[PDB]
């Protein structure tokens, strides 16, 4: 039990143990491979509309894809989102991980 009546006591409690001024002390910041330098954020009304991540899938193959078991598999649209993958695409991704190689 400890009472932090002021900010000095809170700082004393939260302070890390002393470390030498020759070793790495500050953690290296995270860098996300899609916003390495800017961090866009919204700056224009509406400030809180819903933003959905979309990653294009396009056409990974342009050749006739036979059906896996019974599912068609062959593509039917260009608008498929890779962050919201459909049933048959997930089925293909699972079959690839099970291929014997």
């Amino acid at each position: 039990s400890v009472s932090f009546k002021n900010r000095a006591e809170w700082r004393a409690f939260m302070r890390l143990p002393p470390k030498s001024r020759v070793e790495p002390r500050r953690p290296i910041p995270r860098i996300f491979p899609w916003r390495m330098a800017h961090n866009p954020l919204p700056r224009r009304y509406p400030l809180y509309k819903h933003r959905t991540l979309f990653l294009p899938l396009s056409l990974p193959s342009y050749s006739p894809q036979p059906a896996i078991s019974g599912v068609a598999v062959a593509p039917l649209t260009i608008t498929t989102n890779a962050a919201q993958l459909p049933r048959t695409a997930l089925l293909q991704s699972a079959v690839r991980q099970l291929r014997p190689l």
Binding site: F13, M14, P17, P18, S20
Partner: protein, 149 residues
């Protein structure tokens, strides 16, 4: 966010306090008749050895003190701090004041292997041949493994 940081730091503080208590309780005592000043004299601190001993209230404090505390000590130089650290570690590891090659051999000579100096039987010969077949004597040094097996 602040609460999560606070609780994690509280957990770490409790852990560190327990660890410090255990280390201080299980510190290795000095030999009979030695004090902090005696240890400083034996290590030959020289300058302000009595003052350093006065700063360090007990052998447990001296043994478990950190480099930060040693630096905080008034009048202690970098060389003196390094000397103290080295000798404290050597004593805790039992390589000092018995600092002699004969002492090292006497204290830390490995005991003989279980089957060392035993006459060879047919079972031993068969096991040795099986180990040789398994380890392909032609490659490298099979004996490193076969001797331990």
């Amino acid at each position: 966010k602040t609460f999560k940081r606070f609780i994690l730091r509280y957990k770490q503080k409790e852990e560190e306090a327990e660890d410090l208590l255990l280390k201080r309780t299980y510190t290795k005592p000095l030999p009979e008749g030695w004090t902090v000043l005696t240890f400083l004299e034996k290590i030959n601190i020289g300058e302000n050895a009595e003052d350093i001993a006065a700063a360090f209230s007990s052998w447990t404090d001296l043994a478990n003190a950190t480099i930060d505390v040693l630096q905080s000590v008034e009048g202690m130089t970098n060389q003196q701090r390094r000397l103290i650290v080295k000798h404290v570690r050597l004593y805790n590891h039992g390589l000092w004041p018995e600092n002699s090659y004969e002492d090292y051999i006497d204290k830390f000579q490995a005991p003989p292997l279980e089957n060392e100096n035993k006459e060879w039987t047919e079972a031993d010969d068969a096991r040795l041949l099986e180990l040789a077949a398994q380890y392909d004597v032609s490659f490298g040094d099979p004996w490193l493994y076969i001797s331990w097996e």
